């Protein structure tokens, strides 16, 4: 009793793969056959039903409308048509026969790892903000911190102030330029991997989540944010 | 000098939308425009760029062959066409213009929202606690799976789960012990409450253990118990 899985690998964002699923040593006629994925790292997540006839497919939606489950009973193998994959997609596939009230997953293939991205076997430039948030009054000073994982080409990092439910706003560029119509209490320094963004003295309308952005290469990151809060 | 942009709203996964971006105050045919997102509670993400003819446009592998970022430079306008949509491409996106070294992005349009779903207002979530247990063998291991909603006729699984291995089946129907499966494993617990029991553990029982609700058309798992020996 076995389900023998084939297919996946390493594919560029926007392609396409075919996973195929061969079962031996059950009826599998009388089967409905799902997949199921696990991203790196994390949990099992559903994706895709198919009845034993080929009929009643039912998709996640992190699939639906690009991927297609289907089977060939005569050949006692299951499918699934993987379409405009994205890297969001990137995680070990499995077919499982789903016995339901008798057996639930019963029978599970190895799994393969499909992994969608364009990516060189280098990394990006990861920006790391500190503290993830301060409570502060107004009146205090407050001093933001963006590390860098590698040095920044040109000091091409920049800072942004986003208010709730608004766009982002271009505070600092260029490390330590301020732009135009930011009051000279935003000061923002630094060079190399280490940055620091400093408010003088905090206004009630500085109150927001403030965001560091190198664009050095073709690459561009953000750091994940600081949150100025009232305390 | 701003950027107006239209476009968004709320699709089924797999369809598609197109989103424009209208300039105005200044020479828009000579800039670099980019789209940046925002998914919802995270952080700013570069998503595409575009500028003169003679350059290459770019776009980030979490949406490229998908979508494609163009312009209109007699209208003024920035596009970005985004197809078959998906859950991940959830977020609120921007245009900005990009001026490099002379100011990053100083310019950014007011944002809209894209949702990419198929849900209706209300899926049964397990949450498994804890998230962790260290024990040495021979002890006995309690894991625990509780679930938003009450679970139809008790179809509630558990599984095994060791490092570079696929999922092996324990218990079903809350409380079935698959054949093979070693009777110190045992499954209790009803309705939105249920238990996996472990004793006499053997160092072989190192593996992470995760329920599944099959009850409806839309199966979920928990998120999983890490035990280690």
């Known amino acids: 009793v076995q389900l023998v899985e084939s297919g996946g690998g390493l594919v560029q964002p926007g392609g396409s793969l075919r996973l195929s699923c061969?079962?031996?040593?059950?009826?599998?006629?009388?089967?409905?056959?799902?997949?199921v994925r696990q991203a790196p790292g994390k949990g099992l997540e559903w994706?895709?039903?198919?009845?034993?006839?080929?009929?009643?497919?039912?998709?996640?939606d992190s699939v639906k409308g690009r991927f297609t489950i289907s089977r060939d009973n005569s050949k006692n193998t299951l499918y699934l048509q993987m379409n405009s994959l994205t890297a969001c997609d990137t995680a070990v596939?499995?077919?499982?026969?789903?016995?339901?009230?008798?057996?639930?997953?019963?029978?599970?293939?190895?799994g393969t790892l499909v992994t969608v991205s364009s990516g060189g076997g280098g990394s990006d430039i990861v920006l790391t903000q500190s503290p993830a948030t301060l409570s502060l009054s107004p009146g205090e000073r407050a001093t933001l911190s963006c590390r860098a994982s590698?040095?920044?080409?040109?000091?091409?990092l920049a800072w942004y102030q986003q208010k709730p439910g608004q766009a982002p706003r271009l505070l600092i560029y260029?490390?330590?330029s301020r732009a135009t119509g930011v009051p000279a209490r935003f000061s923002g320094s630094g060079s190399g991997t280490d940055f620091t963004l400093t408010i003088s003295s905090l206004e009630p309308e500085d109150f927001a989540v403030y965001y560091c952005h190198q664009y050095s290469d073709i690459s561009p990151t953000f750091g994940q944010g600081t949150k100025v809060e009232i305390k | 000098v701003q950027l107006v942009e239209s476009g968004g709203g709320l699709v089924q996964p797999g369809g598609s939308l197109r989103l424009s971006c209208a300039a105005s105050?200044?020479?828009?045919?000579?800039?670099?425009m980019h789209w940046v997102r925002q998914a919802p509670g995270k952080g700013l993400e570069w998503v595409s760029s575009?500028?003169?003819?003679?350059?290459?446009?770019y776009y980030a592998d979490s949406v490229k062959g998908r979508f494609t970022i163009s312009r209109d430079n007699s209208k003024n306008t920035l596009y970005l066409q985004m197809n078959s949509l998906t859950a991940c491409d959830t977020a609120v996106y921007y245009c900005?213009?990009?001026?490099?070294?002379?100011?990053?992005?100083?310019?950014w349009g007011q944002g809209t929202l894209v949702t990419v779903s198929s849900g209706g207002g209300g899926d049964i979530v397990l949450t498994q606690s804890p998230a962790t247990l260290s024990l040495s063998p021979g002890e006995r291991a309690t894991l625990s799976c509780?679930?938003?909603?009450?679970?139809?006729?008790?179809?509630?699984?558990?599984y095994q789960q060791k490092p570079g291995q696929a999922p092996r089946l324990?218990?079903?129907?809350?409380?079935?012990?698959?054949t093979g499966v070693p009777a110190r494993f045992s499954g209790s617990g009803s309705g939105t409450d249920f238990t996996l029991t472990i004793s006499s553990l053997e160092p072989e029982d190192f593996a992470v253990y995760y329920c599944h609700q099959y009850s409806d058309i839309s199966p979920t798992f928990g998120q999983g118990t890490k035990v280690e020996i």
């Open positions: 900005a213009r990009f001026a490099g070294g002379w100011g990053a992005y100083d310019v």
């Open positions: 105050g200044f020479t828009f045919r000579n800039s670099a």
């Open positions: 590698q040095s920044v080409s040109s000091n091409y």
């Open positions: 575009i500028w003169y003819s003679g350059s290459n446009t």
């Open positions: 260029d490390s330590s």
